[PDB]
From a paper:
RedE, an IRED, serves as a biosynthetic enzyme in the formation of the indolocarbazole natural product reductasporine. RedE resembles the canonical IRED fold with an N-terminal NADPH-binding Rossmann domain and a C-terminal helical bundle mediating homodimerization. Here, we present crystal structures of RedE, including apo, NADP+-bound and two ternary complexes with AFA and NADP(H). These crystal structures reveal an unexpected secondary indolocarbazole binding site adjoined to the primary active site, and site-directed mutagenesis shows both are critical for catalysis.
As the substrate and products of RedE are transiently stable, we elected to use AFA as a mimic, because it shares the planar indolocarbazole core of 3. Processing diffraction data of RedE crystallized from solutions with 1.2 mM AFA and 10 mM NADP+ show electron density consistent with both AFA and NADP+ in each protomer. In this structure, the positioning of NADP+ is similar to that observed in the binary complex. AFA sits above the si-face of the nicotinamide C4 with the maleimide carbonyl situated 3 Å away in a geometry ideal for hydride transfer. AFA is enveloped by a highly hydrophobic pocket lined with M119, T121, L172, M175, W210ʹ, F217ʹ, F235ʹ, L239ʹ, T243,ʹ and I246ʹ, and anchored within it via interactions to D168 with each indole nitrogen. Lastly, the guanidine group of R242 hydrogen bonds to the maleimide carbonyl. RedE maintains this active site aspartate (D168); however, it is solely used to anchor the indolocarbazole substrate in the primary active site via hydrogen bonding to the two indole N-H moieties. Inspection of the active site reveals there are no candidates for a catalytic base in RedE, with the only protic residue within a 5 Å sphere of the AFA maleimide group being R242, an unlikely proton donor. Given the ternary complexes of RedE have little to no room for the Rossmann domain to move toward the dimerization domain due to the tightly packed AFA in each binding site, the structure of RedE may represent a maximally closed conformation despite resemblance to other IRED open conformations.
Residue numbers in the entry:
A (entry chain B): 0 to 289
B (entry chain A): 2 to 290
Write the structure that this text describes.
Amino acid sequence: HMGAKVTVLGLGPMGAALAGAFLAAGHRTTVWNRTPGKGGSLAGEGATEVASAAEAVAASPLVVVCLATYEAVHEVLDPLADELAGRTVVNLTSGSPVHARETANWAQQHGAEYLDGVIMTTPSGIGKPDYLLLYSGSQAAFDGSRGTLCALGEPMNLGTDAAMASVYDTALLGLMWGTLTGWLHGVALMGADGPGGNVTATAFTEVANRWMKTVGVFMNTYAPHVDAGHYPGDEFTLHLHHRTMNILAHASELRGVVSGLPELLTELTGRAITAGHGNDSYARLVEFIR
Amino acid sequence: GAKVTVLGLGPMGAALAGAFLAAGHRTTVWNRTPGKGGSLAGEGATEVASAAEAVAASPLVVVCLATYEAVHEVLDPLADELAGRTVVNLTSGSPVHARETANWAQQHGAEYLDGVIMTTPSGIGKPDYLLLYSGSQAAFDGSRGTLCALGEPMNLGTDAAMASVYDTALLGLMWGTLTGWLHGVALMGADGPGGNVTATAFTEVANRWMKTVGVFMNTYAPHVDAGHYPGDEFTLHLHHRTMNILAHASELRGVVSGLPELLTELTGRAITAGHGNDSYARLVEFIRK
Ligand SMILES: NC(=O)c1ccc[n+]([C@@H]2O[C@H](COP(=O)([O-])OP(=O)(O)OC[C@H]3O[C@@H](n4cnc5c(N)ncnc54)[C@H](OP(=O)(O)O)[C@@H]3O)[C@@H](O)[C@H]2O)c1
Ligand SMILES: NC(=O)c1ccc[n+]([C@@H]2O[C@H](COP(=O)([O-])OP(=O)(O)OC[C@H]3O[C@@H](n4cnc5c(N)ncnc54)[C@H](OP(=O)(O)O)[C@@H]3O)[C@@H](O)[C@H]2O)c1
Ligand SMILES: O=C1NC(=O)c2c1c1c3ccccc3[nH]c1c1[nH]c3ccccc3c21
Ligand SMILES: O=C1NC(=O)c2c1c1c3ccccc3[nH]c1c1[nH]c3ccccc3c21
Ligand SMILES: [Cl-]
Ligand SMILES: [Cl-]
Ligand SMILES: [Cl-]
Ligand SMILES: [Cl-]
Ligand SMILES: [Cl-]
Ligand SMILES: [Cl-]
Ligand SMILES: [Cl-]
Ligand SMILES: [Cl-]
Ligand SMILES: [Cl-]
C-alpha cells in the first residue's frame, strides 16, 4: 500500500531495470553497483544509491541480487555473512542448479531466507504484463515478498528446492527453441514457390497463433501420460505421427526447406515404432530421449 | 436449417455430419459402403443410397474421403450434376491434388473450396479447433455460417492448394513444440538438483510461458517478411550461448533428443556468417533454398 524497503545489488541492464520497476511501484529502493556511475538516472527516479554493498544490505530486509554470475554473487555476499542474518535474499542471477543449491545452503547457514529465481524476459519486459519471473526456495520468503516482487512481473512459486528455477529456465528455453524452430520451418515451407505457396510469414503466423491453442491441448493431454507411464494413443498414434512426418519431409525436400527437423522427428518416432509402440501417444517418446 | 450433404462416413466424415446435425442443419449423408449411417439417421440425418441423390439434395456438398483418387471416383460421374453447387473438399492430400481438383471443379461450374481438418474426430464441433479453407471466396463467404458447425473456419486465401501446405507447416510447428516440450519434461524429471519435477507441474508453468513464446513469433514474422532481423535485447549471440548451456545441462542429466545439437549447428552457421546481433528470424535464411 505505502511501499516496502527493497535493495537491488547490480546495476547492469537487468538489475537497473529491476530497480526501476521497484521504484515505479512506489517502493523505497536502495541500489548499489560495484562500479560507480551507473545509477544517476535511477537517483532521479527516487532511488538511493550507496557506495558499498554493506550499506545497501543494511538498508532493507529484502535484498534482490542480479549480477553477472554466481561467482560474482559470492564475491559480493561472502564478506556480508553476518550482515545478512534475518534478511531475505532473492537471487535473480542466472546460473546452474548446483550453484543455486550451494548459495541456498550458505544463506541458510547464516540465517538469511533464500529464494532463487530466473527472469523469463529481457530488461524491457520487466514490469509489463504476462512476463514471468520464476522463484524457488524459501516459501516464507516468497509469501512475505510476493507483493513487492509483483513490481517486476508475474511471480510463480515453483517449490521449495532452490535449484528448481535454474532447471525450469533451461527446460523452458528448450521448449521455446523447439517451438520457434518448428515455426521457422513452417514459415519457410509456406514462403517457398509452389502450388499453395508464396504465403507471407505474417499470414502464416496469424493462423499459427490460433493453432497453438490446439498444440497446448496436446501438451496438457500428454503430461499425465508421462507421469503415469501409460501412453494411450487414442485418435493420434505414433504410426500417424510417423506417416505425416514423412509427408512433411517430402514436402520440405521438394520446396528446398532443409532444417534437420523432419529427420530428427522421423528417427525418433521410428525408434519407438520399431520397439513396438506405434499405437501409443507422442508421450511415449519421453522414454526414447531420457 | 441450411441444407448440407456429407459424402463419406468414415470416422471423420461421420463426425462432420454429426456436427452439422448438432447445429441444426438439414443434413443428407451418403457412403460408398452401406450400413454406416444408422446413428446419424437416429440424430435426424437423411441417409440416401447413391451419391447422385446426395449431391442433388443440397447446394453445399462436403466431401471427406480417404484419398483424392476416391474423390474423383465419386464425383467424376456427377460432373453435370455439380454445376452451380458448392463443393467443400476436406480430404487430405497434396497441393497438386487440390489444384487439379479445383481446376476440374471450375471446368464444370462448381464452386470449389479445399480444406484441411486440424483435429481428430473427437475435436469436431468443439471450441478452438480449426478447419482451414482455400479456394473460392464466394464459397467461403456463402458457406461460412454452415461450416462454423464443424469448428472455427479460417479462409487462407484464393489458391485451393494453400490448405494442404498449411497443414504440413502447422504440423511441423506442432512437432517442434512437442519435441521441445518432451525435452523439457525429461530435463525436469531427471535426477539432480532442482529435478524430479513431474510433467504436469512443468506443463503448468510451460502453459504460461507459451504466451511469451507467442510474443516472439509475432515479433519475428515481420522480420522475415521485411528481410530485416534486428536482434534488440535477444540476439543470435545470446541464443547460441544459452543453447550451449542447454546442451551441457542435457548431457549431465542424460537427456539425448538431438535438439540441442540441431540448434547450436543452425545458430552457429548464422553467427559464422556475421549475424550474431540479429533476431531468431534471420535463421530462415539458413534453412531455406
Ligand atoms: N539482460 C537480460 O536480458 C537478462 C535476462 C534474463 C536474465 N538475466 C540475468 O541477469 C543477470 C545480470 O544481467 P545483466 O544484463 O544486467 O548484465 P551482466 O553483464 O550479466 O551483469 C552485469 C552486472 O554484474 C556485475 N558484476 C559482474 N561481475 C561482478 C563481480 N565480480 N563483482 C561484483 N559485481 C559484478 C556488474 O557490475 P559492474 O558494473 O561493476 O561490472 C553489473 O552490475 C545475469 O545473470 C543475466 O544472465 C539477464
Ligand atoms: N480421422 C482423422 O483423425 C482425420 C484428421 C484429419 C484429416 N482426416 C482426413 O479425413 C479423410 C477421411 O478420414 P477418415 O478418418 O474418415 O478415414 P479414411 O480411411 O481416410 O477414409 C474413409 C472414407 O473414405 C471412403 N472411401 C475410400 N475409398 C473410396 C472410394 N474409392 N470411393 C468411395 N469412397 C471411398 C470410405 O468409404 P467406405 O466406408 O465405403 O470404405 C470412408 O467413407 C482422410 O482424407 C483423412 O486424412 C482425418
Ligand atoms: O544472460 C542472459 N540474458 C538474457 O536475456 C537471458 C539470459 C539467460 C541465461 C544466462 C546464463 C545461464 C542461463 C540463462 N538463461 C537466460 C535467459 N532466459 C530468458 C527467457 C526470456 C528472455 C530472456 C532470457 C534469458
Ligand atoms: O490421415 C490423417 N488422420 C489424422 O488425424 C490426420 C491425417 C492427416 C493427413 C493424411 C495424408 C496427407 C496429409 C495429412 N495431414 C493430416 C492431419 N493433420 C492433422 C492436425 C491435427 C489432428 C489430426 C491431423 C491429421
Ligand atoms: Cl554513492
Ligand atoms: Cl560462475
Ligand atoms: Cl536447497
Ligand atoms: Cl506455382
Ligand atoms: Cl490467437
Ligand atoms: Cl440408404
Ligand atoms: Cl490420391
Ligand atoms: Cl540431487
Ligand atoms: Cl495459462
